[PDB]
Design a protein around this ligand. Structure first.
Ligand code: HEM
Ligand SMILES: Fc1ccc(-c2nn(-c3ccccc3)cc2Cn2ccnc2)cc1
Length: 393
């Protein structure tokens, strides 16, 4: 037989039995990626945390020419170090302030947007597609608001994403076409005097402030493209798969409908059990480092399997169960850990909380309109998502 291939399954509605078998028998295991490279797949909570908390397992070095690769780059190689570049430019605090859910009126905007989307689905009549006509447009609208860019520019930026977040063995020509176009758009935004709010309004001011005169225009535009894309793909995909998990648990759906104060705890468990990330998080070793029974060598690729950690019964007893009273509820790895912990975590939580609260109020009888096996799972992509999510209510 051949070396075990990753990823195991593109389905986001169930974890393969194989994950628990691997975690028990070989929590760091050699695998082959879609490029043909070998990698170490890490699947226990303890070892996933170790890798994420040791910067000698480097994100930036995954972009090096000649490295073993999980998948092809979809951005210029310097952009792999995007957060590091933002920090080196003195922009980290400002970027992170702009993308919290705390700006006045933001939560109300999200509730209003969710309720409008849902009212339109009710008017049109069942079946409704909760991914294309709810979760993704909600994500897109939220990120236009957060960035300060016109709502009407959202759809075109959004349509880059089905290519931009591919997990491909080979370079993708369309990813460069869309990247270059979206960078030109964000560069125009920075020159547009009407853009005075959100992340892009703040970057536009900092760009003209003397304390940032040597930061490149390229970096300013890149922040807009990267934060829009990462935020929209992550929140739309997470909310979509969380809605499936909720729909397939009518008792929990009814509990959260009846006691919406429990929605934050419910969303935190839906984060823990989420299968949205299609691949392990990649890192390149910059030293020889012992990880469990394996001495990982300098230059080797390590893949941190989030569902490995998050379904580890040694950390989360009865891991497949949504339990709203766990003693360690935010200790999951859904947002990563360590140097590269997601800067959008609070915004992603709020997007999903508000989306679920609105859906349960408007569509308390929401259910799948097709058998669950009829959902079409996107392949060779950095997220697991169903192409359509047909529901009735
Ligand atoms: C529920 C929604 C979200 C989830 C589950 C999620 C998850 C993650 C995870 C697991 C990582 C770690 C990557 C790694 O270590 O290799 C990450 C990184 C990142 N996320 Fe999120 N994310 C979400 C929403 C957002 C939003 C809304 C934004 C921006 C508006 C965002 C921006 C980023 C960025 C920029 C990084 C890279 C940070 C770095 O390299 O230090 N994320 N995210
Ligand atoms: F810190 C970040 C660094 C890079 C990106 C990124 N953005 N885009 C993109 C966003 C919109 C349209 C086109 C492309 C592609 C990537 C590459 N990527 C994917 C997962 N990790 C890195 C986002 C955050």
């Amino acid at each position: 037989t051949v070396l075990l291939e990753v990823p195991f399954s593109a389905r986001g509605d169930r974890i393969p039995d194989a994950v628990a078998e691997l975690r028990t028998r070989e929590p760091i295991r050699k695998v082959r990626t879609i490029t043909g490279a070998e990698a170490w797949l890490v699947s226990s909570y303890a070892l996933c945390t170790q890798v994420l908390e040791d910067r000698r397992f480097s994100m930036k070095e995954t972009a090096a020419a000649g490295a073993p690769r999980l998948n092809a780059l979809t951005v210029p190689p310097e952009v792999v170090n995007n957060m590091g570049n933002i920090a080196d430019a003195g922009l980290r605090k400002a970027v992170m302030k702009a993308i919290t859910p705390k700006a006045p009126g933001l939560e109300q905007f999200l509730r209003d947007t969710a309720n409008s989307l849902l009212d339109n689905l009710i008017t049109e009549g069942a079946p409704a597609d909760l991914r294309n006509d709810f979760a993704d447009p909600l994500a897109t609208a939220l990120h236009c608001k957060v960035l300060g860019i016109p709502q009407e520019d959202g759809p075109k930026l959004f349509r880059s994403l089905s290519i931009a977040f591919m997990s491909s063995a080979d370079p993708i020509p369309a990813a460069k076409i869309n990247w270059d176009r979206d960078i030109e758009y964000m560069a125009g935004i920075l020159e547009n005097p009407n853009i005075t709010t959100g992340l892009m309004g703040e970057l536009s001011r900092l760009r003209k402030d003397p304390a940032y005169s040597h930061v490149s225009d390229e970096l300013f535009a890149t922040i807009g493209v990267t934060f829009f894309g990462a935020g929209v793909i992550s929140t739309g995909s997470f909310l979509t798969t969380a809605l499936i998990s909720l729909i397939q648990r009518p008792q929990l759906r009814n509990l959260l409908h009846e006691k919406p104060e429990l929605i934050p705890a419910g969303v935190e468990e839906l984060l823990r059990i989420n299968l949205s990330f299609a691949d392990g998080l990649p890192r390149l070793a910059t030293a020889d480092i012992q990880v469990g029974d394996v001495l990982v060598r300098k230059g080797e690729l390590v893949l941190v399997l989030l569902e490995g950690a998050n379904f580890d019964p040694e950390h989360f007893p009865n891991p497949g169960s949504i339990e709203l009273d766990r003693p360690n509820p935010t200790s999951h790895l859904a947002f990563g850990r360590g140097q590269h912990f997601c800067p959008g975590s609070a915004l992603g939580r709020r997007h999903a909380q508000i989306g679920i609260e609105a859906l349960l109020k408007k569509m308390p009888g929401v259910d799948l309109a097709v058998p669950i096996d009829q959902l079409v799972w996107r392949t060779r992509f950095q997220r697991r998502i169903p192409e359509r999510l047909p529901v009735l209510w």
